[PDB]
Amino acid sequence: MESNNGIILRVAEANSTDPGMSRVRLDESSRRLLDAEIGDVVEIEKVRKTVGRVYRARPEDENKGIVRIDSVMRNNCGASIGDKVKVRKVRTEIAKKVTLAPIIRKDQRLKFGEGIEEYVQRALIRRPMLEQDNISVPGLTLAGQTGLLFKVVKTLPSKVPVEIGEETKIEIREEPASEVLEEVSRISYEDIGGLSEQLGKIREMIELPLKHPELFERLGITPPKGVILYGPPGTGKTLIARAVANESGANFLSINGPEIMSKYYGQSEQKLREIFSKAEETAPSIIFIDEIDSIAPKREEVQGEVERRVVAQLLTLMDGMKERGHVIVIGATNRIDAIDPALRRPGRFDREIEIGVPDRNGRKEILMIHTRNMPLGMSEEEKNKFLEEMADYTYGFVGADLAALVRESAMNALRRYLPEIDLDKPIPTEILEKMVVTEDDFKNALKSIEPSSLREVMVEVPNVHWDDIGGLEDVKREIKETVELPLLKPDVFKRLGIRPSKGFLLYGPPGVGKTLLAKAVATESNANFISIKGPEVLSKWVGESEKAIREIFKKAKQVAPAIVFLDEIDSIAPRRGTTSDSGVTERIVNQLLTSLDGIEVMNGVVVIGATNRPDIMDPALLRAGRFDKLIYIPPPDKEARLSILKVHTKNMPLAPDVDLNDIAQRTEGYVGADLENLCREAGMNAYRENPDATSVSQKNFLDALKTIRPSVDEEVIKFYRTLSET
């Protein structure tokens, strides 16, 4: 079906969804293989034998083999990933008069628009479209909708696809009509996208058993039986099951726990049996239970037979299906803590994986869907998006939080604009145009926010290198050889016949940037970084979870290769400082000791211990066989202060009057974290350009030493000299 390039192309998913949906991306070779020219309109013909066209655009990070195409236009004429296309340079006539009408069913005959002059005219320019089709029309500030859907009844060019020019007279019939294809409620994997790699991975999980019949959606393969999704309750996760149906091309069944639990003995299990008994005739279909955890919450706790039956009736109906009708079971829950051992075995459930939360990227698509749900749903032209900078700023939140926050962004404009008009009925094209949620209004609306979120730490890749915190190349040299040899050179262990250290321990003065050292080796090795600190050991201790602390390794082992970093362990002991309300050890560390023995370093895992001081740490926690090497971090010396601060101040204001040698020679008994400070302290006095009107010179960096200088930190040092003897 999909061929590299030519009259046939590889249909692939565009990650930006293209600026417009006719803007499809292309590679410079993909055109030469079709004998075409990039930057032009092209006529396409696709399987199912339907007509269509788009506009090819620049490649960005594109592999020559493929062609990244939108799902909407692909789905508008109809298609899926893995189909075949037929395309050529041919440019047919240009639309002259076109007739359009909206879908009246979700409207239920309500609120006709003025878009004849308002939208289509200024949104018109050279948009490749199709005759006898349903075109996505932008506009109409965010409803949570997808653009605006107008049907294409006819365009004056007959039986050929076309793009409309500005020369045209457009007609909005303002009368009945309905989609030529797809539906009014539709969603694609990209419209729902909270993730890129994982979403495509979770796709392959479901997509390999569900593909299409002419390939394996029905064929032996011994596929899995049922699936369960985890992590971010609500948001995009709950919508996944709804997205898998539209793209897979199969019927969709919503099954919720409370609606089953809401119903009672008798009808309850009947309604469940009816749905699964209704799936055979409607097959192919997707069985999805949402709150299943509430249908099978049992661990040892069972308060009734009605629950035993419905889950046991669920057991009967799973095994009762041989996948002859090929109705697949999928599931979701926020926690696996509710699952019964019975539901972990084949014939019932097979492939189940954790789904995480978005990253800078994941929010970007979600933010991209917002500007799409906003006006400019189907974009007329290609425009540089300053929404780019938003995703980098944002953090902490999931999909639902943004959408609700973007609704909190719409109210900010809404509050000011429309109530001034006080709409009884039709709305000014002027007002509705002049109000813009586009790249301008965002930041003004982002000045107000009402999010709330709760999560736990995960993998990260720092930016650290040897320059950020210099000095102590000796430890860094062996830190190189700690990860590198087990990582790159496991075969060197054959010739040696040795078992490398399971881990090493770091201790020394606080404030030296022990975290930077952990991040440094992590950035070098490129392995993922997980730091277990004291505050979070205190945070999850609020809900009384010691298990969660153990899970961090279980979550670290699955995401490996990664570097698991341990600092401020047994956090209950350090947090109280000199005093204590309890003993030197508790039930908490017991869950930590059992963990270290369990976690294996034969994977890309790397065990790194760190502590402010080991003496306060319970000596039994420091026993060898777990941390074999005892490493000591002394405070950076005079030469390090020069290089360290030389790295700090070189990226911020400086002056030639400044001499960096004088400042480092006067300081001793001093740490690295203060070098961050000492660099900026002068700044508050003067910067190169700041409203203070002052400037950088030896004066402010001299005032920095006057503002910050040794705090009498020599104490921690002379403990370490004696601490290494005992």
Added chain:
Amino acid sequence: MESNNGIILRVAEANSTDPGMSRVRLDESSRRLLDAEIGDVVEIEKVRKTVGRVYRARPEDENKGIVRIDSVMRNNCGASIGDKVKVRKVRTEIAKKVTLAPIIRKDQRLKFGEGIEEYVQRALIRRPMLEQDNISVPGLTLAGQTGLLFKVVKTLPSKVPVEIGEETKIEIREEPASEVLEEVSRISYEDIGGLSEQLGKIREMIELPLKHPELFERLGITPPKGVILYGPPGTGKTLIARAVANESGANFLSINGPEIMSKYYGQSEQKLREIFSKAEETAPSIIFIDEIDSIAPKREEVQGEVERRVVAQLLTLMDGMKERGHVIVIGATNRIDAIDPALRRPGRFDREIEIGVPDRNGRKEILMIHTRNMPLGMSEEEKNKFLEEMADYTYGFVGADLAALVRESAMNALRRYLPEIDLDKPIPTEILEKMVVTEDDFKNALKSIEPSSLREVMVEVPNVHWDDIGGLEDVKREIKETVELPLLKPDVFKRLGIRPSKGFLLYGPPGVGKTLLAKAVATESNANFISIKGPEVLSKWVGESEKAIREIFKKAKQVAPAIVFLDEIDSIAPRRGTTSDSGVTERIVNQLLTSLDGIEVMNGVVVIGATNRPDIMDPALLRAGRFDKLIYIPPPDKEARLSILKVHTKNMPLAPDVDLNDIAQRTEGYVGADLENLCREAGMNAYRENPDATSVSQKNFLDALKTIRPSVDEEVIKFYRTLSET
């Protein structure tokens, strides 16, 4: 916006409960538009074809594009705020003989008595009105009283709107009258004390969908499902809810948490299934549960499946709603921490609201609502009856506590008048003439059990500006560099490699109210100010609750850009004075550390820690991204003491009998707390009441100095200087 201008205007709720019923207030500019005199009789025509005539009056705070109007006419008309209204000048038609009878519902047909000349003749003065209207006369004593409802069957001149003058004959039959017009007990937005910003914010959410859904749903925003309210319940929660429903015109559906729990299998679910069943017909409507925390507190550690089925039944009913005939479920609780987060996600309440408590200003509106039914509003008596005076002793009260105060005041009034006359059946006019509410009642009430318990914690509201407080210029400008600059110019600071600050620490001599300085810059920069009083941190720290401490800070983070001031958030440590016997870190700072770092660039944010003892700090605090700058207030300057002494002495009796510089010379080392004591002490020892030009004398200032001693001491000064240098 509310804008409509010219002889034609738009109706907006009066921003004051107003003394009079016919008061419709318009600014000098607004009055010049229709060209009419203040207090003129103008007949206003509006939607539905319902008319009325009113008096003009004035604020200075209005905008010409609105109309501040009575609730009488709006209720008589049944208007929802936001309607475009047509007003014009018309000459006065006057009644001759007027017939009045109360409505059926209010009285129940149980009411009769005297007072024709007590109510009407006193209300006979200057009331413009429409014939066939419900006119209200308040007065006398409160706590059973909202207005007095008289519906007009006839006015001797017929088919004319007429003003009520002094020459008209009056009649009270006390026989049937039309009940069509609502009882004022059915709420009006005026009945909500204060909370103007919260009123509109909540109202716009529910209103616009409930008004016309077919755009504000379709072409805009999205309709939410329900809203939860927070803060002390039972005071404004039940009132605000019905105050949202009645005015919006949406039917109100009453629920009781304890009734559901009082019920069980069957009726429990039947009721929740019965209400929504009734809601479908009345939909769109308002659904409300004040008791949400009672029915669904579940944190896991409840027991039965009956409570889990009914709360899970509630889960199903939320998602079962179509968001077409959309109805809004409202909820209320004392605190969000108690309720269940499974109700917090989409499918159900995603929308949370935080309602605080009144203040000296907030009680101004609450007391005023009570002051319209009682003649305490204008001052005819020997005290200040502008309610700000009564607001002082009332610090830390809520609408319910004040209702009990004025209710117990009618008791104090009742105790005087009724027992001495001791009527039983009769209702003479003289007992009502004899009754006059006097200040003594509140005094006996304020001395009564009215103060009982200290209830729950509160946050203050700021005032102070450069005008209100003096003090050192060095730190102020230093604070501006730290505060004003990042707030107003964060953009350029990002691209210059110049970060002046993230948040900063205030330390120095105590007792001067350094908070005052933080408020002056905060009010100037127009950034929200927040202060955490030490006692609140002292108690909760022992109760192992650091979450209540997060709430106020989190409240500042979401509303940000804002300036959060922390007065001894470490307060446990400063109580130890010089040192920290335990570590310099405790549970609270751990989250402060996390929070200070967790802040994003989505909003310009500057956090302020403040303490009496800086030496107790966790070294992480002082570092980058947490505390960038360290503020030290050196002892007051000689010239600063002079200004401070002058600001405090001219707020009290003063005469030009002194030399303000001479008193300052004798003052050395004295702080703002000491200088303020000199002023209050002098006048007290000075002449209490005199005809003489001299009130406070130079001899009093001079002699008062010999007794006192300087506050700041040398030991605490040395501990400060070493840190600022290091």
